[PDB]
């Protein structure tokens, strides 16, 4: 048997290899980005946005974020999904973005996911899986984003219910807002301190 290659921080120039346009490097014709909605993509369009804060309460202006999620019917666009259902064919399920160098805001244009089966016949509440990489962070931090308008499903979700300190569950619930007709979910991440966001070892 082999040991996993050890993780190392992505460092402050992680944009060069993962978001070259942000480092002002035009080298690729097709650039991976933060827009998961294609013209024929099914589902309700939503914008996910927030900032990442360090232990002094300041925003990380060099953080890179990625999200992985299911389609509107709760099917992952991956060969590893075993539901035997057809996935939306115009949906990658993944995106990557970086916080703005001046303000630290980040966002994704995506679709609200459908519920996905949990273990042993359970049903998970709708969620987006999210990972954070940045200078100072030695191993990407995994967390999940749930939606405040899914109170009912959240209360029964297996993962949220497996966090024994119940006051911490709320840090994983994003707030729904409606900016000029658009549905926006605000999710701020606090790496350290009061109201520290729950991070998982997955």
């Amino acid at each position: 048997e082999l040991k996993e290659t050890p993780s190392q921080t992505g460092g402050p120039y992680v944009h060069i290899g993962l978001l070259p346009k942000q480092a002002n490097i035009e080298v690729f014709e097709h650039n991976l980005d933060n827009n998961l909605v294609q013209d024929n993509t099914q589902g309700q369009r939503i914008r996910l946005e927030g900032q990442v804060f360090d232990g002094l309460g300041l925003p990380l202006r060099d953080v890179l974020i990625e999200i992985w999620q299911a389609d509107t019917n709760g099917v992952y666009p991956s060969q590893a999904d075993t539901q035997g259902k057809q996935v939306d064919p115009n949906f990658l399920g993944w995106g990557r973005t970086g916080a703005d160098f001046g303000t630290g805001f980040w966002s994704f244009n995506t679709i609200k996911p459908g519920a996905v089966p949990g273990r042993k016949g359970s049903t998970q509440a709708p969620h987006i899986s999210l990972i954070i990489f940045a200078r100072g962070i030695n191993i990407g931090l995994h967390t999940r984003v749930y939606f405040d308008d899914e109170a009912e499903a959240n209360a029964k979700d297996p993962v949220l219910n497996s966090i024994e300190w119940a006051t911490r569950r709320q840090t994983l619930v994003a707030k729904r807002e409606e900016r000029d007709g658009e549905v926006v979910y605000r999710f701020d991440i606090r790496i350290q301190g009061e109201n520290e966001t729950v991070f998982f070892d997955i």
Binding site: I16, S78, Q124
Partner: protein, 238 residues
Amino acid sequence: IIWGAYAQRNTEDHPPAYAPGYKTSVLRSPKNALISIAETLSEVTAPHFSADKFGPKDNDLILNYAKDGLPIGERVIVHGYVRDQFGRPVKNALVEVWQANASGRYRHPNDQYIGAMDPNFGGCGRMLTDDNGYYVFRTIKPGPYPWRNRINEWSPAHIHFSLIADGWAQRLISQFYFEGDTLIDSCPILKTIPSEQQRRALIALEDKSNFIEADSRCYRFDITLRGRRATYFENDLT
């Protein structure tokens, strides 16, 4: 074969989040322990990237940014295999890399070092591993990079890399070094890894038989990701 969950990440084989010798980790590390969960479909799936979208020079850092001439520096090929912890090849995984140029200078708005920029070098590439888990790219060997951790901190020459493979749980970012660089024993980021054998797992080896005469040297570097267990009894994933 019915796949079950990925084997647990062995936290002792990786750096801790809090590592005071690497100063920026002090305010960017959680104070709470990570909450371990049992895996679901969310953790074992991952996206698929088609080779169709990739340009012909995407894995050629020597030519993909070259305008008026070739970049200045040591021509090297880096190749290897990506496997899971059970030794199975990782097929069609997305590998993205980035690095400084031959002066130890990064092409990034926040890098202001006096080492000279190279108008013909960009410093980023990508490729998909083949069916044997094999990858190969060509580049300029980067120069060691000075930075401010302690004021006179110098990292050894290195290439950053990222992998997106079969399961989200496998998601990984790290970096490799080149055999014999004397700065490897002083790097505070490398020292966040606890064991010596894991520190050596980030060193690419000189591969002399694959050097190309009057052209390029070659380094061999293999990557190991988490692997899935097979299930023969109850399948609890769903």
